Ligand SMILES: *[C@@H]1O[C@H](CO)[C@@H](O)[C@H](O)[C@H]1NC(C)=O
């Protein structure tokens with residue numbers, strides 16, 4: 245009761261006359277609603293990565309993923325090719341998240357230096373051709389080919405990034421070719437000043453039973469959220485609830501508030517609303533178009549008035565800055581305390 | 582009239598709150614009304 | 625033809641080069657943004673597409689490097705300029721883009737084409753499937769296609785006496801292409817300078833292709849002299865973009881009525 | 889940002905694992921606490 249709350253907050257068994265601040269009241273959400281875009285087609289992953297010989301190490305191919313529903317439990321359960329070390333992603337929350345413009349790439353490497361050429365760390369191939377940002381949103385997956393995908397007859401297959409003068413521009417291939425340049429002018433015809441071809445030195449034999457394994461790598465790019473999302477996770481969507489402090493999950497924008505009609509003159513491209521204080525007060529439906537307002541439900545402070553413990557135990561409660569009708573005591577269904 | 586350019590707001594009943602006081606209020610920044618009113622002060 | 629060179633000139637840009645930088649709607653707020661924009665009162669080249677030498681084709685399609693952005697504009701009375709070909713070296717070995725206005729579609733063709741020395745089109749369709757597609761003859765490999773309603777909604781069928789004020793900004797970054805267009809009627813017939821007035825360049829469509837472009841080329845439509853290929857008069861403006869810091873003032877309608885930079 | 893990854897609690901929670909999200913939230917907590925103590929100190933020095 246208010247007397248017990250005041251005694252607890254005052255750390256005493258006796259309370260003198262006066263008014264005291266104890267805690268605050270708020271309205272808890274009664275339900276949750278999810279509004280998500282509807283996508284019929286399933287997102288192609290096995291047919292875009294699990295395939296024949298991948299792109300060259302120097303010239304890696306980029307595959308694009310958009311307008312699809314992507315599930316990652318299939319790759320989680322699919323066989324060896326383990327690792328999947330997400331730098332800034334929870335590995336179990338990919339399905340929940342709805343992504344934007346996922347870009348797929350094909351890599352081929354030796355495998356003996358995968359640890360050093362791993363993204364986020366400097367390595368031989370990393371300093372040769374491919375550079376990655378300090379923290380890319382995507383995840384790196386190494387496909388450890390054990391027996392079948394390892395070539396045992398072809399001595400070349402896919403070449404190796406043998407040499408490169410310096411690291412290339414960010415997110416660029418290594419189409420660079422021709423002969424090595426010696427210190428005293430570039431050499432001519434190998435025999436001049438020991439020209440070395442900067443590639444073709446993959447050279448793994450079947451007798452090379454101890455030298456690495458094919459470690460094909462895929463890297464994705466996502467997490468923009470400024471534009472409307474394209475690749476959305478496989479989650480159900482339910483009907484929206486208006487004029488209620490409800491848990492909304494509009495296209496991943498999870499939050500609690502009272503949803504009401506909005507008169508905002510949203511331009512056709514504009515998707516999200518905001519206010520002065522960097523708060524999304526409006527939202528656009530990822531379903532049938534409807535501009536919707538966002539407003540958190542009521543809350544305020546609670547003050548306790550007592551005439552003194554010795555005088556009486558009768559107390560009075562003042563609710564701060566709230567109209568009486570909107571917040572009576574007979575609404576104790578989701579109110580605090 | 583001269584000083585009423587900036588004020589507390591003259592309303593704290595939240596009924597009109599659905600745009601400056603409300604933005605701060607939604608971040609839990611309240612204003613408590615003074616004990617004495619202008620009528621008493623003028624008296 | 626054996627046309628001669630022309631000296632490019634410049635004119636004042638006044639208050640131009642404003643587009644919506646963010647998708648979030650806001651009204652009655654003074655937000656400051658840091659992005660690439662046209663500095664106020666900057667030099668802009670204003671190539672005049674006039675019938676060269678009273679009926680001789682001119683090479684008014686310079687190979688202009690793209691750098692970081694463009695401000696292609698038009699004070700054309702009619703529709704004479706179509707084509708915004710981009711390319712690293714403008715050959716069949718480099719992936720190139722083009723924005724045509726054939727019929728009522730844009731045809732955003734992302735492929736490699738062999739390009740003629742002087743690519744041009746015909747404003748009037750040929751009599752009896754027209755031979756206008758002489759800008760390229762061969763196409764090897766194709767990646768992306770986009771067909772939709774034409775990027776020019778302006779019609780001259782109403783009447784004359786009013787020219788167009790088509791405005792365009794082509795922005796490419798980190799494998800994306802954003803277009804911002806806006807048209808207004810013009811009152812004064814003088815084409816020397818753009819009217820002094822604020823304009824907002826609303827985004828139209830985002831293209832996601834990540835082709836590397838180091839040059840810009842435009843095309844013209846010259847159906848027939850009615851010797852050589854020529855048409856009426858035209859004029860377009862070319863201006864580059866650089867990063868800046870700007871302040872925007874959204875109105876009660878939520879639109880940007882004016883903008884103020886922070887370095888002028 | 890206060891040196892964090894994101895200023896949104898839901899974003900920093902769903903986009904991060906527990907063992908790093910704890911210090912992620914801690915940094916923002918410390919920054920906002922510094923802001924609050926500075927503000928209340930200014931309030932006192934003005935009430936002076
Ligand atoms: C800018 O234009 C003015 C007038 O047209 C000219 O005098 C000046 O040389 C130009 N400067 C540049 C850098 O184009």
Ligand SMILES: *[C@@H]1O[C@H](CO)[C@@H](O)[C@H](O)[C@H]1NC(C)=O
Pocket residue numbers: 876877
């Ligand atoms: C813009 O705001 C004005 C004044 O608030 C209003 O009269 C008008 O209807 C709004 N919309 C447009 C398109 O002008």
